[PDB]
PDB file of C-alpha atoms and ligand atoms in Angstrom:
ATOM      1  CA  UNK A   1       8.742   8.659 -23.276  1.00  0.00           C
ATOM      2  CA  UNK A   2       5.333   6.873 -21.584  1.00  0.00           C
ATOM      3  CA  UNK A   3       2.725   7.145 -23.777  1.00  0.00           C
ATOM      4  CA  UNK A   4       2.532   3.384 -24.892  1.00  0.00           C
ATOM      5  CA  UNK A   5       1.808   3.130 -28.886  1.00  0.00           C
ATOM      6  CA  UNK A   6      -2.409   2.433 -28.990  1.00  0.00           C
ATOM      7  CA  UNK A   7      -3.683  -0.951 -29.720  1.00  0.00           C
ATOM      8  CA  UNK A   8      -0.158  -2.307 -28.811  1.00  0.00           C
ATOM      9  CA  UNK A   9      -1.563  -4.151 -25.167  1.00  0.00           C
ATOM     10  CA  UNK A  10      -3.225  -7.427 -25.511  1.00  0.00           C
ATOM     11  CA  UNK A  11      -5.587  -7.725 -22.221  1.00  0.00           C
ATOM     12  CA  UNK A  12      -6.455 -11.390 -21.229  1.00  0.00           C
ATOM     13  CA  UNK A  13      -7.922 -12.160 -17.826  1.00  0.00           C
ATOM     14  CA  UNK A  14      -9.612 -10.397 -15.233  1.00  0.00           C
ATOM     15  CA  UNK A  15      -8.359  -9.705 -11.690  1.00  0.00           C
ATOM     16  CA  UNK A  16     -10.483  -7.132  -9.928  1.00  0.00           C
ATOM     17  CA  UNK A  17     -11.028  -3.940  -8.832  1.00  0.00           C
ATOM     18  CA  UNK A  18      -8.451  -1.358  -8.128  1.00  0.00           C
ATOM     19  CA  UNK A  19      -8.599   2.497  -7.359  1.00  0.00           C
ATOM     20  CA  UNK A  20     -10.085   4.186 -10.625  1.00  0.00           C
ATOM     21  CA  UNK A  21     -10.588   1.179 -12.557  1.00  0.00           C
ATOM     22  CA  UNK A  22     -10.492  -2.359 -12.527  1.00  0.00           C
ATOM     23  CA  UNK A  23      -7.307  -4.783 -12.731  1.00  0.00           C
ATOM     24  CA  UNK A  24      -6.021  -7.156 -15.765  1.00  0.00           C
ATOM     25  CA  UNK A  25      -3.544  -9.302 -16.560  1.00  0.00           C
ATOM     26  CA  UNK A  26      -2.440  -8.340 -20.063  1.00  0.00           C
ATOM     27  CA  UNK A  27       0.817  -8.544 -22.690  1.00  0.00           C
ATOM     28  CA  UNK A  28       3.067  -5.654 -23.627  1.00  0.00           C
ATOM     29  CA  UNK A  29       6.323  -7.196 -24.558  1.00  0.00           C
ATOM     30  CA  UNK A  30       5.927  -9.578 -21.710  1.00  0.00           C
ATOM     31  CA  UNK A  31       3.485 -10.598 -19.143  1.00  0.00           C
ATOM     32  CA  UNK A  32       1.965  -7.033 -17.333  1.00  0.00           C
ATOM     33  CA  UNK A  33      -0.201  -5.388 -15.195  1.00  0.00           C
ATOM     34  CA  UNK A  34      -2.957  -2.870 -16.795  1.00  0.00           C
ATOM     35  CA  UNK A  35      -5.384  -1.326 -14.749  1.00  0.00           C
ATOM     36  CA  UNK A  36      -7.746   0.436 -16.783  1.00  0.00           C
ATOM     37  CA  UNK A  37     -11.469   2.432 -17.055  1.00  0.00           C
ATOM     38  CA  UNK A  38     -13.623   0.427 -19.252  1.00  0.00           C
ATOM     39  CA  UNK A  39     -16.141   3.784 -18.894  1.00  0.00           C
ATOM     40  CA  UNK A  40     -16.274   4.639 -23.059  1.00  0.00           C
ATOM     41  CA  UNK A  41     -15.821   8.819 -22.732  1.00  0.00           C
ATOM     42  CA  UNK A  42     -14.949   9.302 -19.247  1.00  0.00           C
ATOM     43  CA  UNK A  43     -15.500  12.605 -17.144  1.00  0.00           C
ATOM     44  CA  UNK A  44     -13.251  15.636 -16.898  1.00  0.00           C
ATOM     45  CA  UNK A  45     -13.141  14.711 -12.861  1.00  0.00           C
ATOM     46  CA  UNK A  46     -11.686  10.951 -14.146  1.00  0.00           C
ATOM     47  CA  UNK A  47      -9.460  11.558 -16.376  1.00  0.00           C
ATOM     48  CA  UNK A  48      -7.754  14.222 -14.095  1.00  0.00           C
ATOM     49  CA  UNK A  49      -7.457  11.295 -11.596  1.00  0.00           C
ATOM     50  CA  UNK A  50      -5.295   9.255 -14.197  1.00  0.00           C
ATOM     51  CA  UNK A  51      -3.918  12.372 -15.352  1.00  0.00           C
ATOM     52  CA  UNK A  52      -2.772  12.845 -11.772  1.00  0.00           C
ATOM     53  CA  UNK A  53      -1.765   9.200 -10.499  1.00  0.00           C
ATOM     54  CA  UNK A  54       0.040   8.665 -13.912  1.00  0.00           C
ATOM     55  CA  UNK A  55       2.073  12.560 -13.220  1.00  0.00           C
ATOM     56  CA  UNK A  56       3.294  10.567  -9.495  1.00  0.00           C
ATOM     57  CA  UNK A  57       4.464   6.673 -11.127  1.00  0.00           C
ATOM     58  CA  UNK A  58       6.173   8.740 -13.631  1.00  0.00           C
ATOM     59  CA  UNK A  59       8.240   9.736 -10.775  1.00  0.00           C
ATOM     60  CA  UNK A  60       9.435   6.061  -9.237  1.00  0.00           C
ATOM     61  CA  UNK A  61      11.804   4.279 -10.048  1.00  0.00           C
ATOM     62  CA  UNK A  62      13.074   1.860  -7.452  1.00  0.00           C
ATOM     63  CA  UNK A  63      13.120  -1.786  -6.895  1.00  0.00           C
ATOM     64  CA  UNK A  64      10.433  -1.820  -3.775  1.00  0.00           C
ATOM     65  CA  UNK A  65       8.026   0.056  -5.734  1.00  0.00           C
ATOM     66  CA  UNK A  66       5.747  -1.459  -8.663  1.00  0.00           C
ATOM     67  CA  UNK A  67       7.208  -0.786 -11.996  1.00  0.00           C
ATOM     68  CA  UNK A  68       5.351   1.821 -14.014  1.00  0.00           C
ATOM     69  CA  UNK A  69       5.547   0.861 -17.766  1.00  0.00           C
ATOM     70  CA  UNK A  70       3.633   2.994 -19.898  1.00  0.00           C
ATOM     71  CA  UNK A  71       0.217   4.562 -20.153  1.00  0.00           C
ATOM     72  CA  UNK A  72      -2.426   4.547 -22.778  1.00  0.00           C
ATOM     73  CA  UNK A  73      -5.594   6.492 -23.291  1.00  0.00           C
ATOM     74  CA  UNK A  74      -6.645   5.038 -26.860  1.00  0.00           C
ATOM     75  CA  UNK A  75      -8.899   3.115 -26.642  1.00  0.00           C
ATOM     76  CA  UNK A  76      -9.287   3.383 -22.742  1.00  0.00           C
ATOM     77  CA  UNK A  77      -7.362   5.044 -20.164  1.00  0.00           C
ATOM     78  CA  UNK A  78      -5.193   2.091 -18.949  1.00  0.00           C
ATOM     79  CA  UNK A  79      -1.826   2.072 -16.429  1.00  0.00           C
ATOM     80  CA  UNK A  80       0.314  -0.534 -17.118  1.00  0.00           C
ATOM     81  CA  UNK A  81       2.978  -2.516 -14.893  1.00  0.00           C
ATOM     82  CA  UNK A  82       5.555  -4.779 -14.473  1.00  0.00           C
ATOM     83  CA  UNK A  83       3.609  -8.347 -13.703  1.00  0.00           C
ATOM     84  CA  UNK A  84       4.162 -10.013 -10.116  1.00  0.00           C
ATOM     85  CA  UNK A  85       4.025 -13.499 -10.098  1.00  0.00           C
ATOM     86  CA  UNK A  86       3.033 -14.268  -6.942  1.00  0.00           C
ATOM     87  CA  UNK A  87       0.117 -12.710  -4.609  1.00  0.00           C
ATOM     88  CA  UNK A  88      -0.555  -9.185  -2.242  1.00  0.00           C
ATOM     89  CA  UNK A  89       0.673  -9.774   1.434  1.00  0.00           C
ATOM     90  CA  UNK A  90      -2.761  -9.570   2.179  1.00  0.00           C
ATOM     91  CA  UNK A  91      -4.061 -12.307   0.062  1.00  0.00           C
ATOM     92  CA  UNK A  92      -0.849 -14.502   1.650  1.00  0.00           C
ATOM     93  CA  UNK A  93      -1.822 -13.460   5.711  1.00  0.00           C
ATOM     94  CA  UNK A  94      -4.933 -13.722   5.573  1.00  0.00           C
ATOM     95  CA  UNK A  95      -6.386 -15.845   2.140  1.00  0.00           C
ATOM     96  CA  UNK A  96      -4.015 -18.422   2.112  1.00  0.00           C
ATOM     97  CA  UNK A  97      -2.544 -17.649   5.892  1.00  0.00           C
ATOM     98  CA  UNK A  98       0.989 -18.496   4.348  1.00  0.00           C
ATOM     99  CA  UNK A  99       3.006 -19.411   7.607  1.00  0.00           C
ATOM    100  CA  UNK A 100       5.936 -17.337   6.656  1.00  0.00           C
ATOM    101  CA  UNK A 101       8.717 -16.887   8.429  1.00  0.00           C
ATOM    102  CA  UNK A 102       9.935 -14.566  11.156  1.00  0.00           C
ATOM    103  CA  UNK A 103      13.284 -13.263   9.258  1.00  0.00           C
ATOM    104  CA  UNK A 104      10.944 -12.898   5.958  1.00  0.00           C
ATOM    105  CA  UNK A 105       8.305 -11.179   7.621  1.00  0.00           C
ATOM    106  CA  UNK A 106      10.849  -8.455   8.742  1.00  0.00           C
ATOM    107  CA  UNK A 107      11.958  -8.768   5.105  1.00  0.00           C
ATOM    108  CA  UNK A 108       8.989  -7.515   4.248  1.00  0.00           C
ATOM    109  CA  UNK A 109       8.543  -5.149   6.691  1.00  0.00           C
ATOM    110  CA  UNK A 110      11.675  -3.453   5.547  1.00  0.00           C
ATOM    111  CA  UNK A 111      11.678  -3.862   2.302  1.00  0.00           C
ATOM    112  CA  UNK A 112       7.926  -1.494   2.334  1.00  0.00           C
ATOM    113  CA  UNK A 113      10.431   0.272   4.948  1.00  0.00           C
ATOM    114  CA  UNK A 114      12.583   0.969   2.012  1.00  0.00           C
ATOM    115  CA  UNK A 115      10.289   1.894  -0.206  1.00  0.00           C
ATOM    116  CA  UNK A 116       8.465   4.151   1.918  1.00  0.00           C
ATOM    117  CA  UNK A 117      11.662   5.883   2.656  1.00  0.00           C
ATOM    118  CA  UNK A 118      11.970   6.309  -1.572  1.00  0.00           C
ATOM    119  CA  UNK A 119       8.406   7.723  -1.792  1.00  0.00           C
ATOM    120  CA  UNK A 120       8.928  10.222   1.005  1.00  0.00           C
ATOM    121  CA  UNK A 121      12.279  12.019  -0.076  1.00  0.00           C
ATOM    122  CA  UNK A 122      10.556  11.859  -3.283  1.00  0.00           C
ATOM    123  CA  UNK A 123       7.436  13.832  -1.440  1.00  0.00           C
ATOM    124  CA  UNK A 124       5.262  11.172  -2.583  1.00  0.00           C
ATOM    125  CA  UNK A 125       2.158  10.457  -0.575  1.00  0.00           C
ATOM    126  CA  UNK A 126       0.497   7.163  -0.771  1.00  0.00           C
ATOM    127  CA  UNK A 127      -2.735   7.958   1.084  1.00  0.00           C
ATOM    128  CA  UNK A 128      -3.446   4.081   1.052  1.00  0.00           C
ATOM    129  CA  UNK A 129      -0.489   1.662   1.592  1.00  0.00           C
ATOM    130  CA  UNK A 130      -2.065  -1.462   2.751  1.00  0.00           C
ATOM    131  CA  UNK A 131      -1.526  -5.071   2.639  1.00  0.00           C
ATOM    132  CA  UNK A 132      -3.237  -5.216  -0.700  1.00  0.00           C
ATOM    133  CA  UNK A 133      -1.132  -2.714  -2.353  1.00  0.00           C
ATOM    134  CA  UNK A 134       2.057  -4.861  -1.497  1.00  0.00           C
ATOM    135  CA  UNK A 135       2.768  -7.275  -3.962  1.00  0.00           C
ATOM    136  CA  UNK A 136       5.479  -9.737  -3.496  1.00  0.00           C
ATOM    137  CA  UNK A 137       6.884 -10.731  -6.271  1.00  0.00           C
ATOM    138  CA  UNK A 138       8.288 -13.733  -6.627  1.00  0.00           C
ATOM    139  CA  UNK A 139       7.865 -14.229  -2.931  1.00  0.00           C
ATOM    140  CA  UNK A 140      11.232 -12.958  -2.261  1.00  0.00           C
ATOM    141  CA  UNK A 141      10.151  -8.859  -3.937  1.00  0.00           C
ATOM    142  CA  UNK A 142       8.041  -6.322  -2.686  1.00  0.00           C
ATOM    143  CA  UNK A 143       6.931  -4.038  -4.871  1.00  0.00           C
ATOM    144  CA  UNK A 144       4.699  -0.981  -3.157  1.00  0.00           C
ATOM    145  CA  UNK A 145       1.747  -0.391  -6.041  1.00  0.00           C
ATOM    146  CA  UNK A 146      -1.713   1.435  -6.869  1.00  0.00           C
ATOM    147  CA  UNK A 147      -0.907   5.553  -6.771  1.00  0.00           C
ATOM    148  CA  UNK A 148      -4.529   6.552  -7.428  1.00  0.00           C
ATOM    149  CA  UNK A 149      -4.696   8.040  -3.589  1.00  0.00           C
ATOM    150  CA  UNK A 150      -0.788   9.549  -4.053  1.00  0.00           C
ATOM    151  CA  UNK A 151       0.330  13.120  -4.400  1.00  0.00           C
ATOM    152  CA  UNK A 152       3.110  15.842  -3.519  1.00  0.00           C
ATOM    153  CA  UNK A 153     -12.955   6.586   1.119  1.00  0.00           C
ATOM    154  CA  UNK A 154      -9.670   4.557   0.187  1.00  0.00           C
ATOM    155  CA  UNK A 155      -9.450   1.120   2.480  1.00  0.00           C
ATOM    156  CA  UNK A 156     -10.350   1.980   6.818  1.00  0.00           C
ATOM    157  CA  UNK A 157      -8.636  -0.024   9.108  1.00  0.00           C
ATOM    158  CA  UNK A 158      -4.810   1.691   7.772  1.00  0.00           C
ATOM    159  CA  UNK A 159      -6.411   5.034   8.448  1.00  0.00           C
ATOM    160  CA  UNK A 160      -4.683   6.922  11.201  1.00  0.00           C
ATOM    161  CA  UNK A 161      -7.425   8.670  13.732  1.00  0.00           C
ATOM    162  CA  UNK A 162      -6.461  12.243  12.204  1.00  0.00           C
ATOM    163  CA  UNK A 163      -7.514  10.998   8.720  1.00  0.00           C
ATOM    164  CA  UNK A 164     -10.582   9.241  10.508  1.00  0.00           C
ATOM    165  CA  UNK A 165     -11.691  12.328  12.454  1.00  0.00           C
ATOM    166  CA  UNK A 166     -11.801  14.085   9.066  1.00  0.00           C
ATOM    167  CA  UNK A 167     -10.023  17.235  10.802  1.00  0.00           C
ATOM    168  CA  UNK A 168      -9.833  19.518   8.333  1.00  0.00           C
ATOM    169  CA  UNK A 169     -10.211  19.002   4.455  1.00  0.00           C
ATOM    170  CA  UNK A 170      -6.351  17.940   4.003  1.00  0.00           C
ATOM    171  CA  UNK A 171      -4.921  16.025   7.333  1.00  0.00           C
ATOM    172  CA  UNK A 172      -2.806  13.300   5.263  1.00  0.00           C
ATOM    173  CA  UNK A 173       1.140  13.368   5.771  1.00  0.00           C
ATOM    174  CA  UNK A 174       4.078  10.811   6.105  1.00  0.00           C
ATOM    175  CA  UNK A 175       2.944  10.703   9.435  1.00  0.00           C
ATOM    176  CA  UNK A 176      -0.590   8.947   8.049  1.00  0.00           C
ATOM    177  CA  UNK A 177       1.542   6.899   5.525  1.00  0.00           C
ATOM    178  CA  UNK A 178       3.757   5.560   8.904  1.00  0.00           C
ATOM    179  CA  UNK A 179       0.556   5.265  10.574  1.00  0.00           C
ATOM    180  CA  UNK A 180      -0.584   2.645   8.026  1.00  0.00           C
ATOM    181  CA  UNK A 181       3.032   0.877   7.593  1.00  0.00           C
ATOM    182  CA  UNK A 182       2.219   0.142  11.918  1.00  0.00           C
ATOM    183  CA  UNK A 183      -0.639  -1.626  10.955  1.00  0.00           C
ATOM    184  CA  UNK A 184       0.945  -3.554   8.191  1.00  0.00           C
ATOM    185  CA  UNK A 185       3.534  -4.359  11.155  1.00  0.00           C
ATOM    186  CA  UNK A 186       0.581  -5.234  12.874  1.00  0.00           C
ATOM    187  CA  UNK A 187      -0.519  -7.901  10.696  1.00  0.00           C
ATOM    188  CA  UNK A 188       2.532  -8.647   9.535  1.00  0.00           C
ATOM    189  CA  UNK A 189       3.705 -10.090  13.248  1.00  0.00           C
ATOM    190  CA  UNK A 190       0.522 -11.046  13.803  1.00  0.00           C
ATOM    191  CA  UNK A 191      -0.990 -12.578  10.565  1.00  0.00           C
ATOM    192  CA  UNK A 192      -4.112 -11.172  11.481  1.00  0.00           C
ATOM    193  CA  UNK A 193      -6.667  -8.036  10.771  1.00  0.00           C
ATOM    194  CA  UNK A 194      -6.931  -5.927  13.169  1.00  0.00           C
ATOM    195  CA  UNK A 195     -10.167  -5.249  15.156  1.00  0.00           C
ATOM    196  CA  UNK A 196     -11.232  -9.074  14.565  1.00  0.00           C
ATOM    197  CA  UNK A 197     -13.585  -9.021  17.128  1.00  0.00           C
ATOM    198  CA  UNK A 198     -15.807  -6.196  15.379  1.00  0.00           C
ATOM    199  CA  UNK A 199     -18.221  -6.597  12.445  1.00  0.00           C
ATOM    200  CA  UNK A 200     -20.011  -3.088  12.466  1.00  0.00           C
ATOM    201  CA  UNK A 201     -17.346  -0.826   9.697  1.00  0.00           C
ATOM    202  CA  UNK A 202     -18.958   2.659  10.932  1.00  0.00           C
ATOM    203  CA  UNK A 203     -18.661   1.643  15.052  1.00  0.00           C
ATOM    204  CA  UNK A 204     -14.648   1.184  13.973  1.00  0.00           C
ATOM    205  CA  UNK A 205     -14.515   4.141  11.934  1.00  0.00           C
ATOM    206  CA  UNK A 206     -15.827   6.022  14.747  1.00  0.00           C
ATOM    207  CA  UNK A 207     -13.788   4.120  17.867  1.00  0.00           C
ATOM    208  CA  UNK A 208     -10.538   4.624  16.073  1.00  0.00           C
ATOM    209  CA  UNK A 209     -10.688   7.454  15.362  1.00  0.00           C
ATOM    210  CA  UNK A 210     -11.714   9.200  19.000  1.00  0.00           C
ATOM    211  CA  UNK A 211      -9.123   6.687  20.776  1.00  0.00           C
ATOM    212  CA  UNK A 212     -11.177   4.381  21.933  1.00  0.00           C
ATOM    213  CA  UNK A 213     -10.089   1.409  20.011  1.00  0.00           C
ATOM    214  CA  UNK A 214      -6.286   0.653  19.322  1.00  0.00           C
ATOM    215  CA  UNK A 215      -4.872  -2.600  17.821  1.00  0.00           C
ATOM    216  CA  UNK A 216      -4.301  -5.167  20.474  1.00  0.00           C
ATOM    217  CA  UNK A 217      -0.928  -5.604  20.610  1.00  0.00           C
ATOM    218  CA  UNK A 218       0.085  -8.361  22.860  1.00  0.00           C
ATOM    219  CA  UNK A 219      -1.588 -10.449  19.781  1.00  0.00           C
ATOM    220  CA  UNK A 220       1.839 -10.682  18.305  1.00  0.00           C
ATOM    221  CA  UNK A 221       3.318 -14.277  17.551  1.00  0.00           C
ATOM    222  CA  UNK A 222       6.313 -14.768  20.264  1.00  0.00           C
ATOM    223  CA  UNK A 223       9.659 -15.346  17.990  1.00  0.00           C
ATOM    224  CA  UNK A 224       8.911 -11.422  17.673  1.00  0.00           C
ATOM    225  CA  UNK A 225      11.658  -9.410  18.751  1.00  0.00           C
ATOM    226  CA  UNK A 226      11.005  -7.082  21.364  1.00  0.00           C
ATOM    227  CA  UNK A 227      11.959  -3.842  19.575  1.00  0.00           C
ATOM    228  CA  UNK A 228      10.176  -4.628  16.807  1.00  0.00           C
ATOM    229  CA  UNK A 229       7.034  -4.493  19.156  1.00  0.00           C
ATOM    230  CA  UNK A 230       8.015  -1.229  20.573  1.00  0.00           C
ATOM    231  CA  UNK A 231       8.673  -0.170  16.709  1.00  0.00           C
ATOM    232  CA  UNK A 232       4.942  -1.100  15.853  1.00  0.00           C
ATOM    233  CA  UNK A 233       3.776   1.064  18.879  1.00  0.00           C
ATOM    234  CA  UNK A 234       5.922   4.178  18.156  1.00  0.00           C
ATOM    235  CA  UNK A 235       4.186   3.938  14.507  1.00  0.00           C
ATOM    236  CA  UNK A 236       0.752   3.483  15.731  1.00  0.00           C
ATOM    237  CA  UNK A 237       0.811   6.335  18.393  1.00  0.00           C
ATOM    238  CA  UNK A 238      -2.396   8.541  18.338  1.00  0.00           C
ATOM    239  CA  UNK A 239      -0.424  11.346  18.520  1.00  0.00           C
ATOM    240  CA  UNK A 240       0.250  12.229  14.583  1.00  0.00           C
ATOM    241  CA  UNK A 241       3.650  13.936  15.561  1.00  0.00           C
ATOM    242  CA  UNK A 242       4.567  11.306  17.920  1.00  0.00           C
ATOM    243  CA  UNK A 243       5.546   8.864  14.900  1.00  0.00           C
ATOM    244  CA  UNK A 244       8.681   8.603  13.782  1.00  0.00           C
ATOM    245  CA  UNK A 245       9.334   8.924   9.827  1.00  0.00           C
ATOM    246  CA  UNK A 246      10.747   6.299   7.608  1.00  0.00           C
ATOM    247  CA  UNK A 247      14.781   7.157   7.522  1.00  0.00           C
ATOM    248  CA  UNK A 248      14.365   6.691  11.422  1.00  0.00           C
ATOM    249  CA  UNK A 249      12.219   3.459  10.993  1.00  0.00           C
ATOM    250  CA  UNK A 250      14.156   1.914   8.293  1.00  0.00           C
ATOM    251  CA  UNK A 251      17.408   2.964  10.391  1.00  0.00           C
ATOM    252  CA  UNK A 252      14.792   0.658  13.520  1.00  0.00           C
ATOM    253  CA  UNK A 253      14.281  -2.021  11.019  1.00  0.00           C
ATOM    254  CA  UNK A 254      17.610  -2.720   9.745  1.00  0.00           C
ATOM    255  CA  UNK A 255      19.097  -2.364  13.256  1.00  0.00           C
ATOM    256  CA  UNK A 256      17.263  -5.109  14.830  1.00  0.00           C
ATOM    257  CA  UNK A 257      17.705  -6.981  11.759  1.00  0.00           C
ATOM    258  CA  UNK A 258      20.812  -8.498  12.621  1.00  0.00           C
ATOM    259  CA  UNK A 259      19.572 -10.899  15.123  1.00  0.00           C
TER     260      UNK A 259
HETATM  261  C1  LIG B 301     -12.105  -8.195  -5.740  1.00  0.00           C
HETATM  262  N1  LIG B 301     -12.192  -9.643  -6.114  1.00  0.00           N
HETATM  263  C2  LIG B 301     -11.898  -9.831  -7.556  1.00  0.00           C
HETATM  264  C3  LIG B 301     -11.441 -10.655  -5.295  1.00  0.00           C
HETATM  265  C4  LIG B 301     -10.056 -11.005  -5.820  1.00  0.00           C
HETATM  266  O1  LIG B 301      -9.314  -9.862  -5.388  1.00  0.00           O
HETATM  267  C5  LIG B 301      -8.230  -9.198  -5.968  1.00  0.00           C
HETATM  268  C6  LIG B 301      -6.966  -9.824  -6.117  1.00  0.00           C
HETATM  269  C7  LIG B 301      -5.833  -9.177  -6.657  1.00  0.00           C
HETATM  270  C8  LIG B 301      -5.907  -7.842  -7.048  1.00  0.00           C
HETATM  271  C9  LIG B 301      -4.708  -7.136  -7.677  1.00  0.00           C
HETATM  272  N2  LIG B 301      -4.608  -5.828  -7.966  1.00  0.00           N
HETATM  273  C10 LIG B 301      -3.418  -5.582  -8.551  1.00  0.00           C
HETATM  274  C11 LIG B 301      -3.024  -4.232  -9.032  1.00  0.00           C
HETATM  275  C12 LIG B 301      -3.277  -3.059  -8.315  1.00  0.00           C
HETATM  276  C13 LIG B 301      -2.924  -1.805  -8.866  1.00  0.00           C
HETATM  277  C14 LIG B 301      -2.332  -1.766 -10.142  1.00  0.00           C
HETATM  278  C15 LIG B 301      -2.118  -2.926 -10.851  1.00  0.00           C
HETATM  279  C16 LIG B 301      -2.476  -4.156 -10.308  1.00  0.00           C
HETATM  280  C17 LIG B 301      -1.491  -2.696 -12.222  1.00  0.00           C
HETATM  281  C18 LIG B 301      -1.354  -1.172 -12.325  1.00  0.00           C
HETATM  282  C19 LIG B 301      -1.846  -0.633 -10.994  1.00  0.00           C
HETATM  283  N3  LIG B 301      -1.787   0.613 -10.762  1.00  0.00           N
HETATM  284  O2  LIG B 301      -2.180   1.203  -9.570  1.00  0.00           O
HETATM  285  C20 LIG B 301      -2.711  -6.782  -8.664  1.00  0.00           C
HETATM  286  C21 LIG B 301      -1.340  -7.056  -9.292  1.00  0.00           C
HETATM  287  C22 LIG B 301      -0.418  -6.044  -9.604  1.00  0.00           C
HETATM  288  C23 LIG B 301       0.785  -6.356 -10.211  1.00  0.00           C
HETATM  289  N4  LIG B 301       1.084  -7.613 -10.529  1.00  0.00           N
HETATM  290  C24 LIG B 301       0.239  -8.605 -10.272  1.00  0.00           C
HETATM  291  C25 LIG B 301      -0.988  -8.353  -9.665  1.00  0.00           C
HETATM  292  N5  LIG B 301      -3.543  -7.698  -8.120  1.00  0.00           N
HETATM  293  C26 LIG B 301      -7.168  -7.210  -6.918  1.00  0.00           C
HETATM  294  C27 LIG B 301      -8.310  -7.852  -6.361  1.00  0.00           C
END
């Protein structure tokens, strides 16, 4: 069972912020990850949102998705994880811009290709896979992570147009959460953001989201295989049901893959 024994987690160091609370590296029989909501009595709207996230990492259990521990709520509501060693994707592309590799960068794409694939048949929705909820542990690992948006504003420039347009109340589906694995494809063979060229949030927000403004993709490094670049467009197509879901993208990914 999950409920983690109180006053067993040592907290150390300070990492940042995170969805409902804020980030730490910390000890439970070994190095973890707690995320927790310093707030001393928190409100009946909060805890339902750890009540909630908590109910969905309960539920994973695979290799490409961030290892759910235990969870505590004396003396603070705190999620804990497996620790990576290592960084997010993001902080590699575009902190450090770690040249990486063309057959690793696939690696990654597939490996968040497989564990989209887990969260889907699972009914899982992230609502907010981006390059900073990917860590890669130990380089060679992805592990998928942060399940305060998931279920059964968050961080723009993965938001699909139909989540962007705010069309009705709930407009999220696997078709958003494909939507935002394209533009992880998009950095990911391109090491870059994208809209560079724009510094005004709102104009983006609104251009995205009405068509206007698309990722640029002829910004993708050259070694790039050709289908992968098709790949990237059929996930980035305005048209929600134009996207294909993630058995038929893994099925894309690992295709190509041998070459
Ligand atoms: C914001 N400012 C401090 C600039 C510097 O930026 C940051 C750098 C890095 C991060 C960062 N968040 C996480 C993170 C995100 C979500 C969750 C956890 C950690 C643990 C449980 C959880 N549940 O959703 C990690 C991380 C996770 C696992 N292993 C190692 C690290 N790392 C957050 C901010």
């Amino acid at each position: 069972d999950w409920e983690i024994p109180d006053g067993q987690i040592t907290v150390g160091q300070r990492i940042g912020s995170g969805s409902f609370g804020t980030v730490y590296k910390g000890k439970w029989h070994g190095d973890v990850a707690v995320k927790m909501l310093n707030v001393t009595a928190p409100t009946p709207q909060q805890l339902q949102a750890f009540k909630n996230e908590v109910g969905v990492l309960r539920k994973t259990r695979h290799v490409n998705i961030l290892l759910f521990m235990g969870y505590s709520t004396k003396p603070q509501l705190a999620i804990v994880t497996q620790w990576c060693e290592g960084s997010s994707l993001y902080h590699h592309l575009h902190i450090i811009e770690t040249k990486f590799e063309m057959i690793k960068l696939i690696d990654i794409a597939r490996q968040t290709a497989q564990g989209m694939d887990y969260l889907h048949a699972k009914s899982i929705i992230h609502r907010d896979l981006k390059s900073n909820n990917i860590f890669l542990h130990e380089d060679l690992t992805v592990k998928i992570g942060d399940f305060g948006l998931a279920t059964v504003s968050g961080s723009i420039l993965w938001m699909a147009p139909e989540v962007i347009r705010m069309q009705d109340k709930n407009p999220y589906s696997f078709q958003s959460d494909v939507y935002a694995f394209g533009i992880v494809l998009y950095e990911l063979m391109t090491g870059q953001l994208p809209y560079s060229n724009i510094n005004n949030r709102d104009q983006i927000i609104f251009m995205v989201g009405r068509g206007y403004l698309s990722p640029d993709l002829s910004k993708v490094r050259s070694n790039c295989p050709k289908a992968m670049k098709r790949l990237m467009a059929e996930c980035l197509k305005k048209k929600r049901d134009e996207r294909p879901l993630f058995p038929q993208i893994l099925a894309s990914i690992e295709l190509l893959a041998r070459s």
